[PDB]
Each structure stands twice: as C-alpha cells, then as structure tokens.
Amino acid sequence: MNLFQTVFTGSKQALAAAEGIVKQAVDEKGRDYKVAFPDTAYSLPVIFAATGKKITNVGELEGALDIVRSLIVEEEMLDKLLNSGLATAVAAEIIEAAKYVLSDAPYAEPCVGFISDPIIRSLGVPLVTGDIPGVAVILGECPDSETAAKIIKDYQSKGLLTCLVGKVIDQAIEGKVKMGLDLRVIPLGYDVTSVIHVVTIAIRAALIFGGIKGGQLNDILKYTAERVPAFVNAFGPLSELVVSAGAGAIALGFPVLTDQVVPEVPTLLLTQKDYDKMVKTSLEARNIKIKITEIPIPVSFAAAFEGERIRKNDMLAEFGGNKTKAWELVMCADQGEVEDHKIEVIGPDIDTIDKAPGRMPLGMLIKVSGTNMQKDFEPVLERRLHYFLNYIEGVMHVGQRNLTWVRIGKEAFEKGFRLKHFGEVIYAKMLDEFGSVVDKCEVTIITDPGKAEELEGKYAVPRYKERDARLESLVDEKVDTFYSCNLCQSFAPAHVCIVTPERLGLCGAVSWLDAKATLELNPTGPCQAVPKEGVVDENLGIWEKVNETVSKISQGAVTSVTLYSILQDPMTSCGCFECITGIMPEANGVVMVNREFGATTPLGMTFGELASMTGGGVQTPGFMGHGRQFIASKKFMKGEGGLGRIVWMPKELKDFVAEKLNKTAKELYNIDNFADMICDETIATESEEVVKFLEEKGHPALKMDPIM
Amino acid sequence: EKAKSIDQATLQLLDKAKQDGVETVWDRKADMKVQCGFGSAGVCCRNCSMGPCRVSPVPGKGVERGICGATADVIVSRNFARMVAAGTAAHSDHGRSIALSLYHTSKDGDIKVKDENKLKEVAKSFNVETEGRDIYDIAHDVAKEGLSNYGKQLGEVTLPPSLPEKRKELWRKLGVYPRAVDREIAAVMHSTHIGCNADAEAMIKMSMRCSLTDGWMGSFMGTEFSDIMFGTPHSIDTEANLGVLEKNSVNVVLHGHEPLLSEMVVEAASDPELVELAKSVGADGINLCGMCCTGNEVSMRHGIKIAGNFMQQELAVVTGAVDGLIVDVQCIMPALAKLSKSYHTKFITTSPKAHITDSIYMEFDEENPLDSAKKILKEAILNFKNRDQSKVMIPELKCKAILGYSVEEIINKLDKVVNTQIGPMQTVKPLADVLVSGVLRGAAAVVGCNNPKVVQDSAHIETIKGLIKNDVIVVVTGCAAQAAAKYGLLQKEAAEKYAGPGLATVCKLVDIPPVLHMGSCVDISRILDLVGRVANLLGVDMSDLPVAGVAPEWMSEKAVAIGTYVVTSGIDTWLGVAPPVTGGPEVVDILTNKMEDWVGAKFFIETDPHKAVEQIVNRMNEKRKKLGI
Ligand code: SF4
Ligand code: SF4
Ligand SMILES: [F-]
Ligand SMILES: [F-]
Ligand SMILES: [F-]
Ligand SMILES: [F-]
Ligand code: NA
Ligand code: NA
Numbered sequence A: 001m002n003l004f005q006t007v008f009t010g011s012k013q014a015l016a017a018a019e020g021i022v023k024q025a026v027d028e029k030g031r032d033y034k035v036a037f038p039d040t041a042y043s044l045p046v047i048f049a050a051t052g053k054k055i056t057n058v059g060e061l062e063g064a065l066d067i068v069r070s071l072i073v074e075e076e077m078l079d080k081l082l083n084s085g086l087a088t089a090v091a092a093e094i095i096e097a098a099k100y101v102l103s104d105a106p107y108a109e110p111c112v113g114f115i116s117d118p119i120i121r122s123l124g125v126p127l128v129t130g131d132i133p134g135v136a137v138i139l140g141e142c143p144d145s146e147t148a149a150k151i152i153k154d155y156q157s158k159g160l161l162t163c164l165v166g167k168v169i170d171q172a173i174e175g176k177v178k179m180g181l182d183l184r185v186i187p188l189g190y191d192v193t194s195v196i197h198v199v200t201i202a203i204r205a206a207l208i209f210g211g212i213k214g215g216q217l218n219d220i221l222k223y224t225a226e227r228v229p230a231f232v233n234a235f236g237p238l239s240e241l242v243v244s245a246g247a248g249a250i251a252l253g254f255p256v257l258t259d260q261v262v263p264e265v266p267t268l269l270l271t272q273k274d275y276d277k278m279v280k281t282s283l284e285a286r287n288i289k290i291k292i293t294e295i296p297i298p299v300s301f302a303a304a305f306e307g308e309r310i311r312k313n314d315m316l317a318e319f320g321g322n323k324t325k326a327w328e329l330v331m332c333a334d335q336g337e338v339e340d341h342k343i344e345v346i347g348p349d350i351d352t353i354d355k356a357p358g359r360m361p362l363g364m365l366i367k368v369s370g371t372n373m374q375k376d377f378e379p380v381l382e383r384r385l386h387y388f389l390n391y392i393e394g395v396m397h398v399g400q401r402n403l404t405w406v407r408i409g410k411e412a413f414e415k416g417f418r419l420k421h422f423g424e425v426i427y428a429k430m431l432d433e434f435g436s437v438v439d440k441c442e443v444t445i446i447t448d449p450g451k452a453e454e455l456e457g458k459y460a461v462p463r464y465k466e467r468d469a470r471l472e473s474l475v476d477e478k479v480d481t482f483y484s485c486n487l488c489q490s491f492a493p494a495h496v497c498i499v500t501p502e503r504l505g506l507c508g509a510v511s512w513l514d515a516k517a518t519l520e521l522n523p524t525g526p527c528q529a530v531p532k533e534g535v536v537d538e539n540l541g542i543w544e545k546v547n548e549t550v551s552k553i554s555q556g557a558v559t560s561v562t563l564y565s566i567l568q569d570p571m572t573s574c575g576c577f578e579c580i581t582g583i584m585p586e587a588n589g590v591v592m593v594n595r596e597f598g599a600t601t602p603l604g605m606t607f608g609e610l611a612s613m614t615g616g617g618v619q620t621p622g623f624m625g626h627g628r629q630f631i632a633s634k635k636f637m638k639g640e641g642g643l644g645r646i647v648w649m650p651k652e653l654k655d656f657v658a659e660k661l662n663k664t665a666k667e668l669y670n671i672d673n674f675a676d677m678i679c680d681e682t683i684a685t686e687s688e689e690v691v692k693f694l695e696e697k698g699h700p701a702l703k704m705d706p707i708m
Numbered sequence B: 001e002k003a004k005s006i007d008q009a010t011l012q013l014l015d016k017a018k019q020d021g022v023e024t025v026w027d028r029k030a031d032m033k034v035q036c037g038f039g040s041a042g043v044c045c046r047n048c049s050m051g052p053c054r055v056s057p058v059p060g061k062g063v064e065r066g067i068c069g070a071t072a073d074v075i076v077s078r079n080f081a082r083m084v085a086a087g088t089a090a091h092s093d094h095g096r097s098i099a100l101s102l103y104h105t106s107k108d109g110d111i112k113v114k115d116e117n118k119l120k121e122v123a124k125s126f127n128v129e130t131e132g133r134d135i136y137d138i139a140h141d142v143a144k145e146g147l148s149n150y151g152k153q154l155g156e157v158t159l160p161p162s163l164p165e166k167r168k169e170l171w172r173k174l175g176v177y178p179r180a181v182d183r184e185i186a187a188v189m190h191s192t193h194i195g196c197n198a199d200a201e202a203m204i205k206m207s208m209r210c211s212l213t214d215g216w217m218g219s220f221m222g223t224e225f226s227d228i229m230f231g232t233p234h235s236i237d238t239e240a241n242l243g244v245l246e247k248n249s250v251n252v253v254l255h256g257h258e259p260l261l262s263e264m265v266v267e268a269a270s271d272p273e274l275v276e277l278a279k280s281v282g283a284d285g286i287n288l289c290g291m292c293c294t295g296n297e298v299s300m301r302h303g304i305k306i307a308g309n310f311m312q313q314e315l316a317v318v319t320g321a322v323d324g325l326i327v328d329v330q331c332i333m334p335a336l337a338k339l340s341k342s343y344h345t346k347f348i349t350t351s352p353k354a355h356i357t358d359s360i361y362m363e364f365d366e367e368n369p370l371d372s373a374k375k376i377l378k379e380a381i382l383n384f385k386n387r388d389q390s391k392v393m394i395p396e397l398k399c400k401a402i403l404g405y406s407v408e409e410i411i412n413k414l415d416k417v418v419n420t421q422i423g424p425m426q427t428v429k430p431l432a433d434v435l436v437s438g439v440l441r442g443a444a445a446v447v448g449c450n451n452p453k454v455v456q457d458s459a460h461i462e463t464i465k466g467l468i469k470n471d472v473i474v475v476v477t478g479c480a481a482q483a484a485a486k487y488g489l490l491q492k493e494a495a496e497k498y499a500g501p502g503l504a505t506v507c508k509l510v511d512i513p514p515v516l517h518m519g520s521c522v523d524i525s526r527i528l529d530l531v532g533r534v535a536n537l538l539g540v541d542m543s544d545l546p547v548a549g550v551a552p553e554w555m556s557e558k559a560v561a562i563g564t565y566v567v568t569s570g571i572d573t574w575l576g577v578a579p580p581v582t583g584g585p586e587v588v589d590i591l592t593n594k595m596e597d598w599v600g601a602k603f604f605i606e607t608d609p610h611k612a613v614e615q616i617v618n619r620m621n622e623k624r625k626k627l628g629i
C-alpha cells in the first residue's frame, strides 16, 4: 500500500474510534458533563494549541470531531499528510479525553496515564539545560523481552527520558527495568492513543516556556521541532493507525525510527533492524550528543590525566625515542577500503611480555573514510592522537609522526590494559570530535617488526614526504595570514604560538597548512587566523596585528612578540618543544639540545634543566623552544644571524639534519662542511674545551657581531 | 503584437537593435511570414531529383503519393529519421573530439587527467586494467576503447553500467540495440535514400536505434571524458544574463559547444602577460563570459558567468561591449558575421567544422591548445582599443545562479540526509526514497532550445515553475537551464519562493535549489545516469519510474535526437514545439501512442506549458499507481 493512503486509512480509523467512544460519552453522561484532565490549565492541550479554544463539556468534545474531519484531506501531497497526521493526534486526545469522562480514575499504576502540569514544569527545565538530552517515545512490541530491556536501560543510562506505550511495558517489567519519574522511565498506557500524553508534554512545554499563545499552531510546531528533543521508536508489526500516529510525530518534528520495513523518508521515518545499534541511530536522527563519549577501556579517561609524569621505576612498556622505531599515521581512504570499528593488534601484545620493562616497535595505522574528508585534513586528525592518548590514565605520548615516544605504566596493566583499547579510544574520539567529516574508522596497532617495516616506508613515509613537500615551497613573505594556537594554554596560560610557513609550531606537529586546515574544520577551535598587516620590521618579524591578538589571547600577559628573534621580545614556549636553543656568550652563538639527549650541555645544564628555563609561557630572552624542522629554517634567528650561530648539538641532531642543514648553510654562503664544524658530545661538552674546538675549525659565528 | 521575450534585458537590447538598424533572429522570422505548410507537416521530400515532391497532409485529398510511390507516412518518417541522424552526428563528432583529446593527454602536456578517481572508475566499464598502471597509459587505453564505440564493425559496443539490464534486453527483443555510432548514422542515411525503406514503423525503429548511440555513447562518453580531463562538476556559484558584461573590462564571450577551446581560454585568461596586456590597453581585466553550451561547460566547472542563451547571442553583440566573440561549432547563427560588421566586435571562428564566411578564422591548434587559445585571446584583448564607450549599453540586469550538479555531486549532497548507522553512503537511495514515499511526486528534466515560434524563455519558465509547485523536482540542461539561471530559479531561495511543500522540505534537508542545473546538452547523459541508477536501485526499469522530459522551446535536430533517445530509454517526453510530423497519421500514432507498447513511454506534443504540466503530473501519478507508490 502507498504510504499516503496508509496514513489516511489510519487517520480515518482514528476518527472512527473517536466517534464511537464519544458516543458512549453522550449516552452515559449527556452532552453537558465536565470534560477535563487532572491538574492542567490548558484543558485539552492538542486541541488548545491548534484552535486556542478550551473544551469543557461533552457536547464540545463531540463537536471537536469536526477538527479531525477538517484535517483529513485525502490528497497525495506532503502538507495533507502532515495535517492527516495531526488529525490522528487530535482524535487521540478526543478518545483519551473520553476515557477520563467515563471513569474518574481510568488509568491505574503501573500505567501513569495523563501527565499533570506540575510534572511538565519539573521535567521541562532539565530539557532546556539539556541535562536530559532527549525524550524517547518507544511504542510497540519487541521480539524479545531481553532486547527491550537492553534498549530502555541504554536510554536510561544516557540520562534521557524514555516513555513506554504498548506491550513493551510488560516486556520492560519482565526485563527487570524500574519505572518512575525519578527513574526517567514513564509508561503511558497500553493503547496506541496514549502516545498523546507525551505529545502533550511537548505542546504544554511550548505554552509554558516558549510563552506562545494557543491557536498559534505553526509556531507550536516550530517550537516542538527546534526545542524539545523527541524521537519515537516503533517496534513490532505496525498497524495503519500507529503509522498515522507516526505522521503526527513527523508534524511536531520527531523522527520515527522503526524495525518494520516501511517507505523511508530521510531524517524522518527510518528502518533500523540492528537493535544493538538502534540507540545510536535514534540519537543521531535527533541530533543528540551525549555530554561524555563512551569509552570501553576500563582505565580512567579525562583531560586531567594528561601531563602525568611516569618515571622509569613505574613504566611497563616503552615505544619510540631513539631506542625503537615507532610511528603513527592517519590517512584518508575509500568507503569500501575500511571496516568500521575494526581493531587489529598485529604482534606481541602486553600480556605476552611478562619480563621487566622492555621496548617494542609501535606502528599505529589509522584508516579513515569520509564523504567530505580530504588529504589536507590528515595532519589535523594525526594531531589529536597525542591529545587522545595522553588523556588515558597511565599512558604517555609525545612526538609527532615517526619520531613519537610512548610510555605505558604499571598501574594500567595491573588494571587490565590491552593494546585493543588503543583503537577503541581512537575510534570513539575521532567520531565524537569530527562527527561531520568522518564516516568510518579502522585502527591497526603493530608491534610486529616486519609489518612495522612493511608499513613505514610504504604508507607512512610517502604520506610524510608529500606532506613536508607542500611546505618546502612556501615562504613567509608569500602568505598574508599567520595562525595562532592556544591548545597548550591548559598548562601555560599566557602562551600563544604563531605558526608561519617558515616557523612551524614548536611542537612540530602543527604547520601553517595544518593550522589553516584546523580552522576550516573548527571555526570555534584553537587555531585562528591573523592577517599580516601593520609590519614595523621585516628582519625580526614584528607585526602590529600579531601583537593585538597575542595580547587578547594571553589576557594581557604578553604585549609584543618578534617572530625571528630570540633576544628582543621572544615568543613564549610551552612545554612540548622537541628541542631547545640556549644562548652561549663564549661562542658568540647558541647551543641546541634535544629531548632524547640526556647528558650535560656546555651551558652546565641538561635538557630537563634547560626546559625549566624556557617553558611556562614566560618571555625568556636567549632561550626558545622549537620543533626539529625549524632548525633548518631560513627565518630561524634571522635577526641574530641565522643557523650560523649554532656551535653545539648532540650527534643525533647532526645526523638527522645533515641533509636539511648543509643546504641552508650553502644558502647562506657557508661551505658544505658546516654540519661538521658544529661541536658534539663525542668531541667536548664544556665551554673551555668547545671554544678551542671552534677556534680550530674557523667557525663563522666567531667572526660575527656579538649577540648582545 | 506578440511579445518577443519575457526577459527585460533581452527586451531593452532589442530596442537598441532597432535603433542601430540591425537585424535579429526575430526580424528574420517575421520576414519569413507564413511558412510552408508542407514542410511544416513533413510531407515534402527532396531525397532525389525526380522531385521535389509534396503530398497532401490531409489523407484522401490532393496528391497522395510521391513520384517514386512514397506515401505521406513514408515521406514523414524518413524526414524525421534524417533529423535524428543529424542530431546524432552533431553529438557524435563532439564526443569523438573529446575522446581524441583524452588519447593525447600527457603528464606535462596542455591536456591532463584531472579526475583520477573517475578515470579509474570509467576504466572498469571498458575492462581496462588500472592496478599499478601509469594513469596516462590507463587514459589512453580508455580513449582507444571509447573510440572503438564510434566505428567498430565486429563485436558489441560498451554501454554504461547505470543502463538497466531490463532495458538492454528490451532493446534486443525490439531490435533497436545500438551498434557503432557512425555505423548507425550511415544506416539511417542509407535507408532514407530513394527506393529503400518505405515503412513507417521500421523507419522510426531505425531512428530510435540511432538515437541510442547519442545518449548512452556519444553524449555519455563526451561527458565522462570531459569530466576526466577538466574535472567533475561540483556545486558552484555564478551570475547569469547580459549584465555580466563589464564596461571597463575586456569582454570575451565564448559561444558554441566543444569545451576544449573554452577550457584553454579560461587558463589563458590567467597568463600574466595577457593579464598585464588588458591593463595596458586601459581595461580593468579580462571578463570571460559564456553563452549556450560552451558557456554551460565552463560555468559548471569554473563558474564563468553565463552571458545568455540561444536567441540572445545577437543581442550580446548589440551592447557594443563584446570585444571578442570566439565560437567553435553548433548553433552559431551565421547572421553574427553580418551583424558584427556594425560593431567593433571581432567575430572569430575557430573550428574547421564550422567555417563562416566574412568571419575571422583562427584555427584552434589542438596540438598546441594553450598556445593557440592565447593567440586567439590576445587578438580579443587588443580589440578593446577599438571600443566606443559612448555607444555601449550594458543592461543592469543579472541574477545569481547555483549549478555544477553532476550525478556525483547530487549523490554527495544526498549523503547528508543518510543516517550514519542505517543506510548506505554514496548511493542515490535518498532520492529513490522520497520518490517511493511520495514526498516528491516525481522528477522532470526540462531541456531544450529557444524558438521564435515561442515567446523566448516563456515556455521554459512556466513549465519549470509549474512542475516545482507540484512537488516535482526539476533538473535542467542547456538553454533551458540558462533560462532558469537568468530568471532566478537556480537559487536555494527559490524553494520557499516557488516550490510546493514536499520539494521545499527536500530542498531544505539536502541544501539544494528546487532546480538543478546538470550542465550542457551532452550532459543530459547525467540525467540518464541518474534515472538509471534509481531504476537499478529499485529493481525496476526506467519506464516504471515517475519521470518525464520536457522540451518547451526546442529547435535543433539535436533536440529531436535527444527527445527520441529519452523516449527509447523509457522516459515520457513533452515537446513544446510541434515537430514536422502532422502530415503522416501513422507516424503520429507511432510517436504518440504505439511508442508506449514498444518502450514504455511516448511523445507528447503540447504547446501550452500549463496544460503540459497537468499531463506530466497526471502521467506520473498514473505510473505511480501502476508501481504501487
Ligand atoms: S606547541 Fe603551540 S601550536 Fe602546538 S598545541 Fe601547543 S600552543 Fe598549539
Ligand atoms: S523519394 Fe520519391 S517522393 Fe521523395 S522526392 Fe524522391 S521521387 Fe519524390
Ligand atoms: F485504558
Ligand atoms: F601536550
Ligand atoms: F562599439
Ligand atoms: F572534422
Ligand atoms: Na560512470
Ligand atoms: Na567588426
């Protein structure tokens, strides 16, 4: 049968029933008996919202059938279907009203029956605050008492209000669920027409909170659709009458999810036969997001857990550093190339290793499918992995791509932590964070040595090379806009990073193109655009609008910033810099120490000691925190003298930047042996010894201008 | 007495044309006065020098048969056939050039592959391997296999996947399954020779067989390959009508059809030398404007402004602001050569397929396409020095329009209303559902030309406005689409303005206008791709869906071929201009009745658009009842 005729037929059936019971009314009690619901100032709310007229006696109830007849034009056009759906609703209020005129107490517990106005007020304010995210009008019969309780307890757990009508009330009491207003589980009645008692919840909610007047029906329907979050779940075989009632929910704005095969209408009438995932489709169909995403991992998850410090004596497993090859990757993929919620651990898990803390390789492959996802968003999704994982109690994550470093603790394993939980966090958070641009997620955590090698140079390296290639072309002068990120104000409140093409974010994981993309996904996000205007000095990089926005975002703690200078008004540093640059006056230059290097530097300090002299969002002259790729930058210390100031690095920093740095040296008319002139820890580590090394090699910094 | 147009800018310039003393297409239609009723009925034949013969369109009276013995039905059906053969050939050579350009794509060449995903998907339809192969070896293998669809003498032809298998086996049993494109054009031309076919049914069946090589091959490959090389269209904003011409900019108007030239002119209009040159002659910049299909082709992909449609091409020159009129082939009124003698406009022909006397021939070198477009554009920019700004009259009338609605983009837009945990993504299911449910009563394609027999754009606008009022979503191509663009229907605001309740709801949910501009007239293949996808998704054939096509103001033989393949594919077609068929009653019964028993659709000839809208709605509801929706 056609869907319009299926609604019309039920609408006529609804009318026919109302004529029958209102005929019982006029015979037992005459046309002059009081008609009223308990504790309601709005008489018959559906009839009141439509026509602004109150119904008091039986003669008026009988006369209100003309309303249902006027709403029931049988023409296959969308508006006539909604009106016909309203007709079924009005006839439901009529039938229900007659129930209360033939019996003084027609409903007896466990069925609540009609809802009084004071309960509307008690229940309305948390609907405005969203403390109850939506209301779930579930009617019909589930194939199994277990499958019904499974669903109502799911809704109950989300905090939202669920209302039962039909056989499910008997299935829910069988399923051990407990009803009550404080339990947010209300049974209306066994008859189909008692759905009108949740419909009168939303309508009376408009008349009280929205302050709209009776008879402003189209303004009511706008309030019910936009404000009150309702959705109806129809289970079991669907009669023509209940399908008609479903049209009424469409009229108020409520999507109708069902398990019965039915002619679907997008965002309005849908079939979901997988009961386990029915709650998810319903919440989405009503655009309902729960305040806290569900996490299957047992260990605690919160933002406060980030930044926790795990020492060698408390760690269980360590991945990354200069010790192991560990990488993470996020790449866009086709819809058929990924299976949703597919978690795979290839290699030794944490249960296999029962010995002392050891080091495993770690390759985190994250395949994502999206309708509007594109290749320019992959670094944005990769960035959140650091913030996703560190939130988990007992695990620590730093680094960016293949230079990552992960530590898991002994507490989480004693609490039953598994590598399977890694994908469970990434799967749920990627959806919650990016619920508009992401369709499916597939996570594969690799501790296998072969597959880690068989997935680094094959999918991880080419995605990085193409990534790092798109920035190599750009120069700060070519662009007209810089970006400001404040994500790390969680522990450095006065700190703001200004990302440029030639000055990457000091974490290394945020680029100028990355910061441009984060703004496209999140306009209310951390990264914000800053136009290159009001330039006062190009050599050191001082911009008037940059000083305007830094003062605002830092809440007046910073007044002026120079981008390409570390002595005059330097940009602050947070606490996630991969390397540190420190001023050495003896060598007329600066030294650079990386996080992984643990011995002393000629400044008489270690990286942990230098890190205490730069971070915290404090304007520190002579010290800066910066990423690894910023070393070979043309604009790196351009005011002081560029890369020519470096005189001391660890050997690991040399070998990693040998290709990138030699080229920037020749670009500044420095002989290709410039990477070799820099001193390292296999030569000398004290200024007394290093100075004579710099006098032997003929370092270009020695014959430069004094830095200060 | 009768109005010449419903567009004000069109009327304003028409008054200037009278003042300047120049001829227009309206004036020449008037000079023709009462046109010969024989040729208007199709009962005149000139297929041999025994004639010209003319038989009476009224059966039983006058001369009955031609000298060779051909009846009125024989003469009409043969004349109808050669129209299809012509329109087929028009789209044929169009797609053949596009396939040849694809064969000559290179990594570093002027023509490249821009939509790798589409090429890989099209290659699967031609059984061309794609795994691990260079993307240009693939494109060449696809081009070769597509070119074989034009002249293969052995084996079967390759047809798109969205063509329902029910319809293929229907064609096979009816005997109209297509062969090679050029091979069918020759076949129709053969049987229409004197002393060959003399049976209306067999003659029409040949015409239907010919038209299939257009919609599902010539026009289809042309569109698919045009997307591969230039980019698949996506939703994009533009301005339409003659107000897009700027007085203080170099106005270069691209008229015609073949998109390679206009695609190269777009890229040539960004060459710093050519940008600096327009500034050196005193202008603000280069203002590219398109007309007709080459204007549609660049607007769908690059949002180039649409100057106007068919019967406006003369009026663009009358503004006195067109510095260059660069044309290729198809639907370039030869009057432009005489008209532009009265203005500084340089009227430049570029294709050896369409030389025009007294024009400026600048052959578009397809072996150096970008260099060649630059050479043509530079001539247009230099001609700006000869403009007389005192005689310039650019009407202050232009409307915003959204277009770029390819099948991929409509599917992409429909994904928004798909529940993440329920339905499938990247399908046409959302559209099928609103049709099955009845929220949308149906879908109607409104295509076609302009024709002086109809108030220009008036039948387009009334047909479209009436269909969207009855909750029938409307897709448009070609000059009808550009007529919707000018009027202001290609706007999301047009939903609450003109649409019925169901269409207005779908428009808000999908974030689309009630009228979807699906591109040029070879891009009608997108409509078949769409409808066929809905039929396949619902397990039915295309004759079973509530769909319809309308040609309210058609003129070209291309439209007759287009209308004929739309019907043979299974879609009812309404014509707003009577084709020359009234003389042969058997031909009339075939096109308007017996056609139903053959392919599940038939032609409708209705000149009142409001009546046509009734018929379309009623026929849709009729088909809906048969299907149970
Ligand atoms: S290092 Fe800078 S760009 Fe990166 S998250 Fe911290 S404040 Fe933002
Ligand atoms: S084909 Fe026959 S009717 Fe036609 S012009 Fe020739 S002789 Fe005459
Ligand atoms: F009851
Ligand atoms: F961090
Ligand atoms: F002029
Ligand atoms: F040719
Ligand atoms: Na295709
Ligand atoms: Na001229």
Ligand code: NA
Pocket (backbone or CB within 6 Å): B593, B596, B597
């Ligand atoms: Na018939």
Ligand code: NI
Pocket (backbone or CB within 6 Å): A488, A507, A574, A575, A576, A577
């Ligand atoms: Ni930071």
Ligand code: NI
Pocket (backbone or CB within 6 Å): A488, A507, A573, A574, A575, A576, A577
């Ligand atoms: Ni930091």
